[PDB]
């Protein structure tokens, strides 16, 4: 009897596993950024879904409400610190507008590729 | 439901450790001990000058009132020195957002100082376990009749 530490899942497979357009989009995103599996896209989509759930929950709350202010600006500052949300749109309504490709872009893979010290995405990997 | 004799049973009925001195010539009725249960509850005059004994009287007996205070309606006054009170309430089923009429039967011990009958709403108070099932002592008969205060009609 020792206090457990909580493992938790970090992805969620889609319910329709066999969508042609979605499969093609997933392969596009895998080839663009050299993702090993399609579990990577699922993980980014899960992170984005958690972010959107928090954003929508805070949006439902009334404007100028301590909960709204505190955690909304906390999430805003966290996302701009990550870099996915541009400084222009720190409004918590453009948070709902982020796409999975945005978080894909901030990976150390793509950043090493952008800096140019790696000349290919797979070379960066 | 109260015997005319102030003691009717085999054992003598006295309030324990309150003694009236017969060698003295005051010759009052007796030395009757009493107390007020507090909470702004008026001790009944029928208890203040009564001649019953009722070991479990909140006003004259050893029992003390403390804890819950429950208001209910008398449903059975026809078992000796004791009352059966119907407490009604509404249980909130949340799966339907709907309430549900429910009732519980609380036994209690009404002192002879009170005159109760089927239908009187009663304020009752918690005390020690008096019997297997009674744990409350009747403290006030709010509605003596309710709708029987005026009975006849003579213009």
């Amino acid at each position: 009897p020792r206090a457990p530490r909580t493992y938790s899942k970090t992805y969620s497979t889609p319910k329709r596993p066999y969508e042609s357009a979605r499969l093609d989009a997933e392969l596009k995103l895998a080839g663009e950024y050299g993702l090993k599996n399609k579990r990577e896209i699922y993980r980014i989509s899960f992170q984005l879904s958690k972010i959107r759930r928090a954003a929508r929950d805070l949006l439902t709350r009334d404007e100028k409400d301590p909960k709204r202010l505190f955690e909304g600006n906390a999430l805003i500052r966290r996302l701009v610190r990550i870099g996915v949300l541009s400084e222009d749109k720190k409004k918590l309504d453009y948070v709902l507008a982020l796409k999975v490709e945005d978080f894909l872009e901030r990976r150390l893979q793509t950043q090493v590729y952008k800096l140019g010290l790696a000349k290919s995405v797979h070379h960066a990997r | 439901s109260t015997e005319l004799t102030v003691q009717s049973e085999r054992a003598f009925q006295k309030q324990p450790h309150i003694f009236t001195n017969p060698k003295a010539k005051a010759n009052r009725k007796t030395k009757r001990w009493y107390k007020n249960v507090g909470l702004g509850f008026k001790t009944p005059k029928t208890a203040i000058e009564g001649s019953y004994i009722d070991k479990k009287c909140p006003f004259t007996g050893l029992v003390s009132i403390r804890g819950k205070i429950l208001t209910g309606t008398v449903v059975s006054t026809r078992m000796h020195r004791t009352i059966v009170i119907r407490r009604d309430y509404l249980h909130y089923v949340p799966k339907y957002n709907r309430y549900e009429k429910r009732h519980k039967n609380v036994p209690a011990h009404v002192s002879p100082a009170f005159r109760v009958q089927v239908g009187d709403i009663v304020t009752v108070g918690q005390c020690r376990p008096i019997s297997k099932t009674v744990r409350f002592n009747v403290l006030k008969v709010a509605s003596a009749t309710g709708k029987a205060n005026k009975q006849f009609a003579k213009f």
Binding site: - | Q7, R10, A11, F12, F19, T20, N21, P22, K23, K132
Partner: protein, 188 residues
């Protein structure tokens, strides 16, 4: 092994409760003392948390108090004449609380004689002046004088010989005594 838990009793409704747990030690009940008269024999019992209890079976003499003038004296219990719970204890001379017994009554008698000196049943100047100050206020009622002439006092025990081990009580006196004579005259 005698339990006093509420589990074995039926519910207020009347359902037969199933056995929830085997009876504990903090629910035990011990054998009745059912004390007797003669040859003092008190047995200690070690109860919960130490706290010696004293079973007072076979008890002959004990303290008894007189409330009117309020004086207590050691005196002998001589039989039991009434018990408000079970007359079987009276027939078996079992002495428990609230039982009604007879008293040798001598110690009260010469205490009265050395205290008022009224010669029931029919010196230094200090004592004489004390008696004069008393001014015959000892007008104690007639029935106690009747049993004083009889010689045996009517006392009701108040101590619990089963628990305490003592045999203390008080004389019936005032309307008290009256009531019990009625009951005794019912027996008579």
């Amino acid at each position: 092994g005698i339990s006093r838990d509420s589990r074995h009793k039926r519910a207020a409704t009347g359902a037969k409760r199933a056995q929830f747990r085997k009876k504990r030690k903090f629910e035990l009940g011990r054998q009745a003392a059912n004390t007797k008269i003669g040859t003092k024999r008190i047995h200690p019992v070690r109860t919960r948390g130490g706290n010696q209890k004293f079973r007072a079976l076979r008890i002959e003499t004990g303290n008894f108090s007189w409330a009117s003038e309020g004086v207590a004296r050691k005196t002998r219990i001589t039989g039991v004449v009434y018990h408000p719970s079970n007359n079987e204890l009276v027939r078996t001379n079992t002495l428990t609380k609230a039982a009604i017994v007879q008293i040798d009554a001598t110690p009260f008698r010469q205490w009265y004689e050395s205290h008022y000196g009224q010669s029931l049943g029919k010196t230094s100047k200090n004592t004489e002046r004390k008696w004069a100050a008393r001014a015959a206020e000892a007008k104690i009622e007639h029935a106690v004088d009747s049993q004083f002439g009889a010689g045996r006092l009517y006392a009701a025990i108040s101590s619990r010989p089963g628990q305490s081990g003592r045999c203390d009580g008080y004389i019936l006196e005032g309307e008290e005594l009256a009531f019990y004579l009625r009951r005794l005259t019912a027996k008579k």
